[PDB]
DNA sequence: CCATCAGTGTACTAGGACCCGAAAATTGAGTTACAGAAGTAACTGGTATACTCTGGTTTCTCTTCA
């Protein structure tokens, strides 16, 4: 079944999972964007028949749209926007409150626990996962340990 | 040079009042009984602080004997 927003936008109604999946991989059945692999002259030719086989165009037209739209750091940052302004800014005045300026303990937790398994392949390639898994974000709210647990509820996120 | 030892830069607590909304509960009117208790709304004595002549007083010349 969809998922719908029971609640305007805190909680969705009751809907099968293995439905959910099901509609979603019938959606992208055989269309090639669930791939599991890695990104990988003689191509080009293929692209663009493949662009003039999908959008009924040209050989021509197709190398010219591969052509136009092509992609299109360095910390110095100027003639800036709304929000670069504001990043800036908050770098400027950072720069003069602060004296060491690295990442805090709870800031590289976070991210090393966040990406700790991203891109990790199996081993085995026999516990390869199939295309198509629904892997399920969900958290475990932690017991109220310390007292002021019952306040911000601590979480632990699994990624099942 | 590897010991040691403040600071630091933060999310994570610790108290500490305080607020926001929801849901339950009450209040309120309407009736009609019921008995009794509050709850004012009414006339009717009762005794004191001024008060107003008044009864006595007081010299002060005089009245009346003596």
Same mark, same amino acid.
């Given at each position: 079944?969809?998922?719908?927003?029971?609640?305007?936008?805190?909680?969705?109604? +009751?809907?099968?999972?293995?439905?959910?999946?099901?509609?979603?991989?019938?959606?992208?059945?055989? +269309?090639?964007?669930?791939?599991?692999?890695?990104?990988?002259?003689?191509?080009?030719?293929?692209?663009?028949?493949?662009? +003039?086989?999908?959008?009924?165009?040209?050989?021509?037209? +197709?190398?010219?749209?591969?052509?136009?739209?092509?992609?299109?750091?360095?910390?110095?940052?100027?003639?800036?926007?709304?929000?670069?302004?504001?990043?800036?800014?908050?770098?400027?005045?950072?720069?003069?409150?602060?004296?060491?300026?690295?990442?805090?303990?709870?800031?590289?937790?976070?991210?090393?626990?966040?990406?700790?398994?991203?891109?990790?392949?199996?081993?085995?390639?026999?516990?390869?996962?199939?295309?198509?898994?629904?892997?399920?974000?969900?958290?475990?709210?932690?017991?109220?340990?310390?007292?002021?647990?019952?306040?911000?509820?601590?979480?632990?996120?699994?990624?099942?």
């Amino acid at each position: 079944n969809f998922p719908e927003y029971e609640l305007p936008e805190l909680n969705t109604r +009751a809907f099968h999972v293995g439905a959910f999946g099901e509609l979603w991989r019938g959606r992208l059945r055989g +269309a090639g964007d669930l791939s599991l692999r890695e990104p990988p002259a003689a191509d080009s030719d293929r692209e663009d028949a493949a662009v +003039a086989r999908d959008l009924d165009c040209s050989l021509e037209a +197709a190398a010219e749209l591969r052509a136009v739209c092509g992609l299109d750091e360095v910390i110095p940052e100027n003639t800036d926007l709304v929000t670069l302004g504001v990043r800036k800014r908050f770098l400027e005045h950072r720069e003069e409150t602060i004296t060491i300026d690295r990442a805090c303990r709870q800031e590289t937790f976070v991210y090393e626990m966040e990406s700790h398994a991203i891109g990790k392949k199996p081993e085995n390639s026999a516990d390869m996962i199939e295309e198509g898994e629904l892997i399920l974000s969900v958290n475990i709210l932690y017991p109220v340990i310390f007292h002021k647990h019952k306040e911000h509820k601590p979480y632990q996120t699994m990624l099942v």
